[PDB]
């Protein structure tokens, strides 16, 4: 695994020893090459895992997340090139350093054979994101947003640490392989109930769970474009990955303890999809859509059936790509209009036709149009839920209908109708933005050809 970690570390001295006007080119080229190298982790086994060493191991759940993490950095650099133009070389190098450190921590987090090492890196990712949000955000609310994004996380994560060390004091190890092979049932006890809660709540808060989702709209709205991209694409999936790893020690207590979270997610997906219908801000609408999709992923993980896990993996990958694309489109509009109010700039199809095509395809993938991987994950989760209980179909279908409604509402409001007359600074789309949009969308339509790459270890 060092053949990916070491180049990502070398990205830092290369960035800091670069010319003042070569940082973006060098960073983009070498991050793309690192993505290409990481692409060879996809050759997974039907047996246990790719156990590289005592410290790092790869799995067909970890490999798609690793590849998406490596692929996201070049897109983040391309998106950040525009709004950082008027800023000094040292500060741009610091921004690229924060992005590189975030990638390094995420890469080490997804392999992380140890649960304490996983926790340490899973919490180390917090610092670069907070600095990016509270340093290079625009509005005055960013500081407040950062505070939320901080404390919520720690409010969930501090009990987990205690639980973790407690387990190693009883089991003797926190290695995931030993934990899986030596797993034992949890008796229905108050102590075991609180151990279950301490294990679950940390990952629940970062999905986020419906009741615990307040930090996400603030953090995603006030963050710069690279921050929003990394928050929606990779950082939300840490909770799902952690739950998928940790639910192996929580059986059979998950059967009883899953009910409040299942109800919260099943009702909150409807609530947040309905919230999307009445939203005056593009970024907030995209954030609430992310909350709905992650609610579906929470349901899938809580059901803990093979089809549930496959659907959850597919949906995590598809949502990451789609939400990053949607945020990039919103930012392309914002850098022209500087308002971030959906109703202000209207009828952009007549002025930006190719960008309108990008908007249409992004809305189509968000709408879960078959045979996209978005719908593959959606349908697998829905079928698993139907087997779990036939009444889930009402909530699932209502969520599908509202999702289509708000996706097409977002498309029609911004692209169709009549152009706003007083806005005359809508310049033609740059090659950088179109390239960014294509680099988001072609991986999705190309992954629909080989779904088993993103269906997880239970395929």
């Amino acid at each position: 695994m060092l053949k990916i970690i070491i180049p990502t570390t070398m990205l830092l001295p290369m960035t800091w020893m670069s010319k003042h006007n070569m940082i973006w080119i060098n960073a983009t080229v070498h991050s793309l090459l690192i993505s290409l190298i990481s692409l060879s982790l996809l050759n997974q086994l039907g047996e246990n895992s790719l156990n590289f060493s005592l410290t790092f191991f790869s799995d067909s759940l970890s490999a798609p997340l690793l590849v998406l993490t490596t692929w996201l950095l070049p897109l983040m650099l391309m998106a950040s090139q525009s709004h950082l133009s008027k800023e000094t070389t040292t500060r741009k190098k610091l921004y690229i350093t924060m992005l590189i450190l975030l990638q390094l921590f995420l890469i080490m987090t997804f392999t992380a054979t140890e649960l304490i090492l996983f926790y340490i890196l899973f919490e180390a990712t917090l610092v670069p994101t907070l600095i990016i949000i509270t340093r290079w955000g625009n509005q005055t609310e960013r500081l407040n947003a950062g505070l939320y994004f901080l404390f919520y996380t720690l409010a969930g994560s501090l009990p987990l640490l205690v639980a973790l060390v407690y387990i190693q004091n009883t089991t003797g190890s926190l290695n995931f392989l030993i934990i899986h092979y030596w797993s034992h049932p949890l008796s229905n006890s108050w102590s075991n109930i609180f151990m279950w809660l301490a294990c679950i709540m940390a990952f629940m808060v970062k999905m986020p769970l419906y009741g615990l989702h307040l930090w996400l709209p603030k953090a995603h709205v006030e963050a710069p474009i690279a921050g929003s991209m990394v928050l929606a694409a990779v950082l939300l999936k840490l909770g799902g990955y952690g739950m998928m790893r940790i639910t192996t020690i929580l059986n059979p207590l998950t059967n009883y303890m899953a009910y409040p979270f299942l109800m919260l997610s099943m009702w909150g997906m409807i609530m947040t999809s309905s919230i999307c219908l009445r939203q005056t801000d593009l970024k907030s609408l995209i954030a609430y859509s992310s909350v709905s999709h992650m609610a579906l992923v929470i349901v899938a993980i809580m059901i803990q059936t093979p089809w549930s896990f496959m659907g959850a993996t597919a949906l995590m990958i598809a949502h990451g790509l789609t939400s990053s694309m949607l945020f990039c489109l919103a930012n392309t509009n914002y850098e022209r209009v500087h308002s971030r109010t959906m109703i202000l700039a209207r009828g952009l199809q007549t002025l930006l036709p190719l960008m309108a095509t990008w908007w249409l395809v992004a809305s189509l993938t968000n709408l879960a149009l078959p045979p996209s991987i978005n719908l593959i994950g959606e349908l697998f989760i829905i079928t698993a839920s139907f087997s779990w209980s036939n009444i889930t179909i009402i909530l699932m279908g209502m969520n599908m209908m509202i999702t289509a409604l708000y996706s097409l509402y977002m498309l029609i409001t911004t692209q169709r109708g009549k152009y706003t007359h007083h806005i005359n600074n809508i310049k033609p789309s740059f090659t950088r933005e179109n390239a960014l949009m294509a680099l988001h969308i072609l991986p999705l339509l190309l992954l629909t050809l080989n779904p088993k790459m993103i269906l997880g270890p239970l395929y």
Binding site: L2, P7, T9, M10, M14, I34
Partner: protein, 56 residues
């Protein structure tokens, strides 16, 4: 021009070097996990006449 563009493009070589160093370190770490090489019940194999180790 040689000795001139090197002073301007020296940084580019670093990422590739890291990839090679990581591969070397991965192999070196592999060399410390040979306690069961050619000893698993599934792959107990009798060595070829001109073979030292089943895998490296």
């Amino acid at each position: 021009n040689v000795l001139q563009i090197v002073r301007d493009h020296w940084v580019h070589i670093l990422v590739p070097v890291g990839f090679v160093f990581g591969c070397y370190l991965d192999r070196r770490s592999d060399e410390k996990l040979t306690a069961f090489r050619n000893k698993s019940l599934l792959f107990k194999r009798e060595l070829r006449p001109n073979e030292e180790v089943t895998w490296k």
